[PDB]
Design a protein around this nucleic acid. Structure first.
Lengths: 176, 183
RNA sequence: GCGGAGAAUGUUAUGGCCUUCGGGCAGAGAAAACCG
């Protein structure tokens, strides 16, 4: 009856219906037509479920985490953020559920590959980490306030122009 | 005895001791030695308290929201973010409590003055607004990731305060703002 | 004392509850309550 694919897939849908704060493991159990002591074998508590949702939104939509070979470091940073953005825009309050999740080991591994690639293109290791953190921080902050300001009742162009302010600022600083 | 100056100071202290998630109007009443029906007369619920706490953290520490006499538009944006950052670092989870608070009428009015300042300095109004949202978003995002990841390549993690990423990152937008406006 | 029990209702506390009337209790893996 219940597999890993089924329970989070409905959890992804109920996250849209209710929101992160209103979300409860009990409403999920009732959504699946099951008792809670049974569902505990899949999700131990609410917090673990949020981790599973965060991992699953990144796996599905953050598809440009790696540079398509034959791509500039600029275009990589661009589309990495655009894919990272679209992943947090995939579901309601997507930035919050992604927020507060300890990262996995492959995410570290992907960071070394991200770090190595920029060093290959002339970056210093110091500036490589600063650069990667800056684009990520601005993308995360942009998505958070976007989804939060969307709780009150365009912002996409503000993200684009802001991202290019980082990139073409990265360009000039690399001139060394 | 109880004035809403004291309740904000103690709520800020309870905000530091307990955190945004644990912070509740009930614990604040216990901290002040009063019943909840008494405290309701000052702050109705948690959400009103969050706005009250957020506003005064900016009032205390966001002291460089205005361009200093005889200062570059560049240095303004740097010191604008640095003050906004220090305001969000003033208390525990300061970025989270600041998040989700819709702004005052004075803040809009302050932003229009900010917009005019950079527009007057050669910015287009469209690009003027983009710059301020970007620096704010990155500063907000930078502080959130910082505050979240403190309740916890080989050379890389070794070289990690979090301020240098903010400082170096902010200069990446301004040095990008400079080139982009030279057009 | 602790077993049914990761019990139920409920969320973000102007209220809901215990009290030996001094006071005490708790938030999505609640305070309570019942039942050996």
């Amino acid at each position: 009856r219940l597999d890993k694919s089924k329970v989070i897939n409905s959890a992804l849908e109920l996250l849209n219906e209710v929101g992160i704060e209103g979300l409860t493991t009990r409403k999920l159990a009732q959504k699946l037509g099951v008792e809670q002591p049974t569902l505990y074998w899949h999700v131990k508590n609410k917090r673990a479920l949020l981790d599973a949702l965060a991992i699953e939104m990144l796996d599905r939509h953050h598809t440009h985490f790696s540079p398509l070979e034959g791509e500039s470091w600029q275009d990589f940073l661009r589309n990495n953020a655009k894919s990272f953005r679209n992943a947090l825009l995939s579901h309601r309050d997507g930035a919050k559920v992604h927020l507060g999740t300890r990262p996995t080991e492959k995410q570290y591994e992907t960071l070394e590959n991200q770090l190595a690639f920029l060093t290959q293109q002339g970056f210093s290791l110091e500036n490589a980490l600063y650069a990667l953190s800056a684009v990520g921080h601005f993308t995360l902050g942009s998505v958070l306030e976007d989804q939060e300001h969307q709780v009150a009742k365009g912002a996409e162009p503000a993200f684009l122009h802001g991202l290019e302010s980082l990139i073409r600022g990265f360009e000039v600083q690399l001139t060394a």
